[PDB]
Design a protein around this ligand. Structure first.
Ligand SMILES: Cc1cc2nc3c(=O)[nH]c(=O)nc-3n(C[C@H](O)[C@H](O)[C@H](O)COP(=O)(O)O)c2cc1C
Length: 168
């Protein structure tokens, strides 16, 4: 209903977590959009947005979000509130951990979206990330490769935070 979650996935991990986010919110509040099938105009239809993306190939956007990314100057995000979550691997890719959500947040915030859902960095071991902005991660950082035991917990906490900063 009122929250549009647009995700991309290469091997399926970011899709399974978008299903949990959806269940945690309610089940009719958020509708999911796999961005291999979305047009950039679909983002226009929501005032509260959640963007989901893994980082692939040392700091790049997942292939479907990369296709869409080059069209994001064509939508105005003023007046919208946006949260971000990504899946990635902090030991394997210690210098590029979660880069994809910092790249997508830079863009959408330049186009006037206001970022909500900032997440602390404690509990992670990484060298560098593009998602680090204003002292925190720009959104929920999950790691299914090395901290899958922590995912359900982190989603429950972040969704409770977002119902506050989204105003549900
Ligand atoms: C060859 C390869 C490159 C990867 N690159 C990055 C990277 O630069 N940063 C990061 O945080 N994780 C990186 N990852 C980890 C993936 O983001 C991670 O396994 C993720 O859950 C995949 O999600 P998906 O199944 O939704 O595509 C890499 C994975 C592979 C196997």
């Amino acid at each position: 209903k009122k929250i549009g979650l647009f995700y991309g996935t290469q091997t399926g991990k970011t899709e399974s977590v978008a299903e949990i986010i959806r269940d945690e919110f309610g089940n009719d509040v958020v509708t999911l959009h796999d961005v291999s099938q979305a047009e950039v105009t679909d983002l226009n239809d929501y005032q509260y947005l959640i963007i989901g993306c893994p980082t692939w190939n040392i700091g790049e956007l997942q292939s479907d979000w990369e296709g869409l990314y080059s069209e994001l100057d064509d939508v105005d995000f003023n007046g919208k509130l946006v949260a971000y979550f990504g899946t990635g691997d902090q030991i394997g890719y210690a210098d590029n951990f979660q880069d994809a959500i910092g790249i997508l947040e830079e863009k959408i915030s330049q186009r006037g979206g206001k970022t909500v859902g900032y997440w602390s960095t404690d509990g992670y071991d990484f060298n560098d990330s593009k998602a680090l902005r204003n002292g925190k991660f720009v959104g929920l950082a999950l790691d299914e490769d090395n901290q899958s035991d922590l995912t359900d917990d982190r989603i429950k906490s972040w969704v409770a935070q977002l119902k506050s900063e989204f105003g549900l």
